[PDB]
Amino acid sequence: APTIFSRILDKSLPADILYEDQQCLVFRDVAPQAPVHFLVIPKKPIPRISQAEEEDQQLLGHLLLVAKQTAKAEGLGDGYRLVINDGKLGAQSVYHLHIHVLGGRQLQWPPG
Amino acid sequence: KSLPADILYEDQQCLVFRDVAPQAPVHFLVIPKKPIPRISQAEEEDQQLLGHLLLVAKQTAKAEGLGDGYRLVINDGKLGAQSVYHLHIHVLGGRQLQWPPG
Ligand code: NA
């Protein structure tokens, strides 16, 4: 059961790719919820953060470092929010691990 | 009346404690013991620690009974609504989270 992210990864679905390496891919959200809204995904198709395991420690740290690097590259110096959704109550849309990065507006509280 | 503080988890690398102004029936906070003021100021040397914090977040979520789903949130700076200038991972569960996430 590959998710739609398999098409972003294999480039069969065009996307605005901000960053790519052997471990991960970064691309703009199809439906931005802020002036800047992008996703950091692992190439390893970890379905959800609840299903990450000890072996994924280095990859998970790499995803946060790529998120904060890309946030700087996208001019989010006045701040931003990183979001990971798990499961139904999380509103997880796609069952491939992704970090949302939202900036360029005041994010409110609570976070949904 | 702010709720009583409570540590859910502690190891050599981190502390997990309840949010005393919770925004969900389950709402806790994952912090490194290492002084990292904000995620934008993490550096390459923090890679293992940052993955450790996400694994602790997921593990604590399971211990708190968040099997139906939950949300992890990291705020950076004023536009992120970052309230304390120390790295915090917010974990929220026990209700439907909405979209957008603020
Ligand atoms: Na201690």
Curated annotation (Swiss-Prot), chain A:
It is an enzyme of class 3 (hydrolase). Coiled coil: none annotated. Residues 4-112 form the HIT domain. High expression in liver and pancreas. Expression is significantly down-regulated in hepatocellular carcinoma (HCC) patients. The keyword Acetylation applies. A motif (Histidine triad motif) lies at residues 96-100. Keywords: Acetylation, Apoptosis, Hydrolase, Lipid biosynthesis, Lipid metabolism, Mitochondrion, Nucleotide-binding, Steroid biosynthesis, Transit peptide. The keyword Ion transport does not apply. The active site is at H98 (tele-amp-histidine intermediate). It catalyses: adenosine 5'-phosphoramidate + H2O = AMP + NH4(+). One of its GO terms (cellular component) is cytoplasm. One of its GO terms (molecular function) is adenosine 5'-monophosphoramidase activity. This is Adenosine 5'-monophosphoramidase HINT2. The chain holds residues 52 to 163 of 163 of the full protein.
